[PDB]
Design a protein around this ligand. Sequence first.
Ligand SMILES: CC(C)c1cc(Sc2ccc(O)c(C(C)C)c2)ccc1O
Ligand SMILES: CC(C)c1cc(Sc2ccc(O)c(C(C)C)c2)ccc1O
Lengths: 358, 358
Amino acid sequence: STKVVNVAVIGAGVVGSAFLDQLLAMKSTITYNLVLLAEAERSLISKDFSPLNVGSDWKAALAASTTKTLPLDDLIAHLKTSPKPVILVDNTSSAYIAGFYTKFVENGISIATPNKKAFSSDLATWKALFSNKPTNGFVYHEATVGAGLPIISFLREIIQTGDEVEKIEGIFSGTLSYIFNEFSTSQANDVKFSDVVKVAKKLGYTEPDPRDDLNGLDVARKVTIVGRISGVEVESPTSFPVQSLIPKPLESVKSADEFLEKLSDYDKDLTQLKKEAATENKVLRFIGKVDVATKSVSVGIEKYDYSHPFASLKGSDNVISIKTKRYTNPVVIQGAGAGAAVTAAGVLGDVIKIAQRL
Amino acid sequence: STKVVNVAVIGAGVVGSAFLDQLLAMKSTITYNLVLLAEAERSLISKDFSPLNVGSDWKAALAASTTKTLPLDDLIAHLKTSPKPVILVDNTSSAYIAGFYTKFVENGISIATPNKKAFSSDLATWKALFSNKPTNGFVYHEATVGAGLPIISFLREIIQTGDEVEKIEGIFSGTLSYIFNEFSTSQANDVKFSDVVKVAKKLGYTEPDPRDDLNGLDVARKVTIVGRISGVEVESPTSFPVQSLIPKPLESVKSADEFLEKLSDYDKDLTQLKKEAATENKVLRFIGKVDVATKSVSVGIEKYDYSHPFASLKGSDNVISIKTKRYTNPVVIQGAGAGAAVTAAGVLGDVIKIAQRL
Ligand SMILES: CC(C)c1cc(Sc2ccc(O)c(C(C)C)c2)ccc1O
Ligand SMILES: CC(C)c1cc(Sc2ccc(O)c(C(C)C)c2)ccc1O
């Protein structure tokens, strides 16, 4: 059998931190050798190309380590000549790394990233990373959308069997759900958008700069990936309507802290829109949407009815519906769409789905 | 790479019929060779292991045949001669054929099936299948719980990464789901239990004798499998409380019809319960339940609140919740738990997950 496979791990911020914690404490039949741990500059490469000497203590092990991080164009090279099968676990968000997902794979290297960029960026950078050339490596990103959830894992499959997708309506953003779930409820309140997003940054539910969340970017990217998988030819994460929540003016408003106290001047709209929603007996939710038929993708504010499940999401859960040919009655998968462990696990689970194939 | 894998298909009633229709029209990167199609007596074996040059309408190729289905004690003693690894697609459910699986694995045969049998005998026959024996065969059965829905996998996964299922709960029966989704609704309906039951019988949603569905048997079996996966040592599908929806009296009647013509005499019993659902705002559902902690499994009638998602299931959908260590906020997967295509696809998808490993 093939229980010998070497793995390279880049990034160890959060989901990267949990990914490692799990990768080792992960008792399994197969054997995973972490041949290199390269964070920022301080790395932990293994020239010898055999399991490292860090164990469940990579914290300072990588810290101390008088090793400077290897250059990417040189990393793909280092690996071309490696013991047994190799894997890559890009725990980052950098577009610089994914920008080179072609080289890694074109060079057999396998990957399992939660980073969208490559899968949401170019459209020809997708019509290759998934070609049928058996010489290149594997790419698994289940954590790019579902996170710990099996959305991509499930769609791909149902597809080959022969099912055809039609629509995909869902809550793909932790931040925006938390925000909307609190701003618009069935109890009916008049909380301002400003205050909610504020409070949401205070608890660290948004990015250091909320803007990176409010512009629909993230969702827009996630939908693009799903939509593509589904069978729609989406050119880019901007090739369709994406309703940003960043006041037309305020997109550059000095600092981020200079955006919060400034944003407060534009709630008069969403509130009016929230109240009006009330007349129709509706709540406000930020959703993604892909309608295969009309090839129409779009992300923005959609108002759902109370009875509707969406209007009943706790915490920051991502919920996605998949109405297909066979599943006339849409399949609804909902759960933690964010989270250190939750997310890494989707990654670790991915790596596993690879090892079994190599 | 390994794009060469031979498959054996036993049974072609319904989900077996769709499974084949799909297995072929299934354009894929890998190559699946149907080395033998054995239904009842008329089979379509392939001595030279070369594929089954037929194409479509294979139904007339299997019916109109001469080669007699080779015994199960003589098939495992034949297939081994296979050049490439082997797979077994048992699109049936007989506590006979099932009781032969380990006799396939221990010899190197892989199994992909919708059969809930072998995975519900006793905690012995089970271990024999998932014993990670070197040359052993692969055992996959996603269509055994929630049909196409990703239950098993998603469970063998998060756990294989380091998750500890804490509490598994859901509605696992197609018919029962359908039945209750119709009998206990948000708006205090007025349907007599036995009426949505005959209506079930009339549309072929239930078995010829509705009792075989009201005994909880099916659910009890599905829970057992999930519970086992979860980590509980369940001896049998009867080793715990399973509330048969079949009156005590009516169990004895012979006539499948006298049972139905009499089921109306026990409608009130179940009707008051639905009225007692004035309790705040609740609906009635037949659920499965596994509480790892206290090793307590059980299947029966549980009353849920209106707001609760379960109290909002359409058609005959199976919904299952999985509250774990990392997923404090339970992961809820719901979709078509029955269906010809839907189910076969879970099987075909399974076969695929195998080929990639052989
Ligand atoms: C891959 C990329 C989108 C990314 C993900 C995460 S984790 C992550 C996943 C989902 C989600 O709704 C959010 C919000 C808070 C921005 C963060 C952190 C940084 C980051 O750059
Ligand atoms: C494997 C076994 C349980 C089985 C499954 C099916 S398909 C199937 C799957 C789920 C479900 O709730 C039901 C009800 C109608 C009995 C049937 C048909 C025959 C059969 O013997």
